[PDB]
Amino acid sequence: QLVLTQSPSASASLGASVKLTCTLNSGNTNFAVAWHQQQAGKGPRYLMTINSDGRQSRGDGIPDRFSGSTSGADRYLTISSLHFEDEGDYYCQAWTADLHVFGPGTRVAVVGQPKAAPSVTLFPPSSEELQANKATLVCLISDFYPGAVTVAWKADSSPVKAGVETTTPSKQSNNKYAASSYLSLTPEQWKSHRSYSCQVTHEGSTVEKTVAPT
Amino acid sequence: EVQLLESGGGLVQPGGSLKLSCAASGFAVNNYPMNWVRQAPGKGLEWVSSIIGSGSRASYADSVKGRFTISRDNGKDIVYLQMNNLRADDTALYYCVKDSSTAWWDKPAASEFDFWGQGTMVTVSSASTKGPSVFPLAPSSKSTSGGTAALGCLVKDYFPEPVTVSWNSGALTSGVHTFPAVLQSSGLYSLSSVVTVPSSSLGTQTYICNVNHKPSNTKVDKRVEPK
Question: Is A93–B44 a contact, with Cβ atoms under 8 angstroms apart?
Fold first, then answer.
């Protein structure tokens, strides 16, 4: 029976407030919920527990800009002053001594923050891989914001789509983003073209890195 | 100093079995009921199982009932999760988590989770392991002394995730960036790790990358030579 629903994704300027909702279903309106924060690429941590009557139990170590509020069957986690530390997926948890139930998950991300351009690195096939009758071109894109990029590949001047494996961007240590693209091809193809190129488009800016057989 | 150290994850076959272990320390463990929470790679949290401190009562989710078995040993403060008849939907990172509230001995109990482990990764797939190949990504021929040159290591075709990469046996952490692996259309993973170094340091300092793929017992130390 017990099922709780959550709010769609959240978006706020840096340092502005944000407020996430966790809604209990019928017959369980008096239940307590707990909030858990999974920052990008890390394990979840316990944030706080709010219950119907108004009590808040927080976890040691969390910043004090997190608070919780109650309205009937509606439990809110409010972040006044939204930081980059606070970005990530927030889940709410309910329990009944016979089972546990988690939320769909709500994502919190800043909006309106300055635009950061990517740095691109292109690696041609190693001679070891060439001797192994194989050839992989490694395009490494890092330190960009926001995490939305599009990659293309080129043999000489003509575009190439066969052999491309591009990852989805993910947050890194400095709250910016990174991705990579791998172009697989035969060593004969590598040696037959003048140059191969990795083209990276981000927020309008299209840059390109180019390597050639030596 | 609360710590939940989980182990026993790996690559298992659809229909196989696997026994997870959680070493719990830093608190009177049997005062609290223990739990298991799993997460698919690109999906949300899902409760799996729970066991009260005495170990005589337990609770499961309908998607794992009768198939999994949570256990507990209080002389060693280790929580176990025995999974039988596994299948694709069970591949996940499994967390071992702790209830915040204690309760009466041997009686039912549950509360909010107050602490999470880092998880242990179980991958249920009929595909088998493979140790990756390793190649040096040499500094480009356009590396003038007095600048930055990028070098690295390419670990190609490995299953399953992940591979750990260090440089010069751990003595080089400055400017190292290891990338999340791409999942190729062949089903195998590939990543590369890159460090950017002073250009004139090439030829004076040798750079060696140390890659480790525990699922296949493959340690590889490759030195990246300028060309």
Answer: no
Amino acid making up residue B166: S
Q: Which domain holds residue B97?
A: 3-124
Of B224, B169, B218, B147, nearest to B192 by C-alpha is B224
This entry's atomic model was obtained through X-ray
- In chain B, what residues touch A180 (CB-CB under 8 Å)? 179-180, 182, 191-192
Domain end, chosen from B124, B156, B178, is at B124
Q: Does B192 touch chain A (CB under 8 A)?
A: yes
A96 φ, ψ (degrees, to nearest 5) = -140, 25
Residue B62 falls in which region: left (phi positive, over 0), alpha (psi -120 to 50) or beta:
alpha
Signed CA dihedral, A199, A205, B42, B100: sign only: positive
Q: How many domains would you assign to chain B?
A: 2
Q: Are A119 and A143 in contact (CB under 8 A)?
A: yes
Chain B residues within an 8 Å CB radius of A96: 110
Q: What resolution (Å)? A: 2.9
